[PDB]
Amino acid sequence: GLDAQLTLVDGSTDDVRVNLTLTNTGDKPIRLLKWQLPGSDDAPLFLVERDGQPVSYEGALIKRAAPTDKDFQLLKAGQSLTVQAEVSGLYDMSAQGQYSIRYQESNAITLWVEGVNAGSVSFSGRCTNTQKSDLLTALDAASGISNNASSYLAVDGQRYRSWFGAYSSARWDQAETNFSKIKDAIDNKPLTFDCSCKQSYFAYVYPDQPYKVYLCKSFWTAPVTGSDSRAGTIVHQLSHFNVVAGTDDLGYGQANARNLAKTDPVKALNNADNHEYFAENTPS
Amino acid sequence: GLDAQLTLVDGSTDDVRVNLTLTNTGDKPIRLLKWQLPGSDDAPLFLVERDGQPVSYEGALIKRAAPTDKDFQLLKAGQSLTVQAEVSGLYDMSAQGQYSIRYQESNAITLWVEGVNAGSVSFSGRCTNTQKSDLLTALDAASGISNNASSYLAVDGQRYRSWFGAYSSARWDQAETNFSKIKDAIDNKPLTFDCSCKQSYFAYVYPDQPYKVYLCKSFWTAPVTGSDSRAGTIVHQLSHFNVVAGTDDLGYGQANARNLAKTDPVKALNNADNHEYFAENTPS
Numbered sequence A, B: 001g002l003d004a005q006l007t008l009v010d011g012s013t014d015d016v017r018v019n020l021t022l023t024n025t026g027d028k029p030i031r032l033l034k035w036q037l038p039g040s041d042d043a044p045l046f047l048v049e050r051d052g053q054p055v056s057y058e059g060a061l062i063k064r065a066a067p068t069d070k071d072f073q074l075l076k077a078g079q080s081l082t083v084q085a086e087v088s089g090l091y092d093m094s095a096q097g098q099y100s101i102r103y104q105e106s107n108a109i110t111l112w113v114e115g116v117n118a119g120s121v122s123f124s125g126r127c128t129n130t131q132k133s134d135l136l137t138a139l140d141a142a143s144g145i146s147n148n149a150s151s152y153l154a155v156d157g158q159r160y161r162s163w164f165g166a167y168s169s170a171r172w173d174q175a176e177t178n179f180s181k182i183k184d185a186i187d188n189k190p191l192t193f194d195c196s197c198k199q200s201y202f203a204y205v206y207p208d209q210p211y212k213v214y215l216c217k218s219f220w221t222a223p224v225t226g227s228d229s230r231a232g233t234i235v236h237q238l239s240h241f242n243v244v245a246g247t248d249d250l251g252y253g254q255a256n257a258r259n260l261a262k263t264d265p266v267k268a269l270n271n272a273d274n275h276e277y278f279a280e281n282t283p284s
């Protein structure tokens, strides 16, 4: 027969990693569908319950052809295979509470889940409970710098001059209106964060697909606040949506933004990093 | 200086491929931002106009760090580099008409665009005008098999028995209600097709993200109608959405579906390929 043993992996993050050991206890080799083993392809391979109630699978479903030889993993007589999966990225484990997880069938393992923490926030692209929690934390920080930016623009200034260049009331109203909409998106709109991107840069968006922001490797290496920070990256990204500010990416980096501000204030007003650096205001 | 020459590539499809030659006409080497050359990363590098009116860029915008040495392509004195891009996947070229394209700046090239052709259809993931047209064609065919499936379920049967097993009125009503919703999605809902997937299988969906269907390699190799066809793949995929039929992927392939129908009609009623094969009805 085929036995499935599941063990929780102990770790210091909020992720939920499990080790699954499949063992062929019989005397003849058996063939296992690779699709039915944890992997790079989403599959609903677990029963996950919070407090006795199943929670949702959040991954994709895939149409595949009938399997051929290529699609099987062979397990010899007596032989075991162990694979590790992170479960929080694939099921709805966002709410605090006592969870069980069973492969499905294995024994159930159980654990406590801390809880990741108008407007709403959704996730896709296998964000783990760590990433979800970090993203919400980064959003609260973005809210802080975006509120600050708005308050500044409403009062009456080197901060403005730095990022947006020579004063004109039309450009200053334009900047204030852009920050007003960014603050409204953070405060009141349905945001989506996606964690599937493995690229070396910070994030990307489609300006016609509000309000979904795709984080990449540099987001995770960035500090939560400060220059080129997780908070500022969310301000940058939001500013691109057609329904927010419609900014472009005309240049990257503080040095470039200060140049654009000096040489062509209209382009600076249309640049995402310029908006980011105005809100990050680091150094102050 | 740096000259940019753009040439249209002649081909027999509806795609819009262009060759861009950048030449360093100066006497010292120059460094070109790789981001500003066509590539795997979306960038808005072209001005595209239909009948004199710019059309929308549809790709992503990316937050990147300031460039370092790594981020440049070097072009020696006198030296040329040529790169090819497909423009239709990245701009809105869906409408019939006379277009110009200029890299931006290059000369403009011009051409005629045939036009790809309640409910609406959107695209993402760099679908070319060929793929868009093929997808719409496949949708009309899906509509045909889905209408047929609905008509069959409303009359009064080996077709039903094959895919859904022993008759009971509750299961037959359930099947009819699932096909009713699939036909309603095709007819009346905002569908999105995405072409970014390079996996060897047919397609995938997130059941909580209606009505976006991601096509992969086997979709493109499939015939438009018949067994495991582009039309049937759209019926399969649609059936998964929580707001359509909420089906699972419990088994793949006609042989498996006929088994499920024979052994556990309730699971057959919950299986996407079973719905697909009922509508494809091939052989009839």
Ligand SMILES: [Cl-]
Pocket: A061, A062, A063, B203, B204, B205, B236, B237, B240
């Ligand atoms: Cl699917």
Ligand SMILES: [Cl-]
Pocket: A203, A204, A205, A236, A237, A240, B061, B062, B063
């Ligand atoms: Cl971005």
Ligand SMILES: [Zn+2]
Pocket: A061, A062, A063, B236, B237, B240, B248, B249, B272
């Ligand atoms: Zn499926």
Ligand SMILES: [Zn+2]
Pocket: A236, A237, A240, A248, A249, A272, B061, B062, B063
């Ligand atoms: Zn950007």
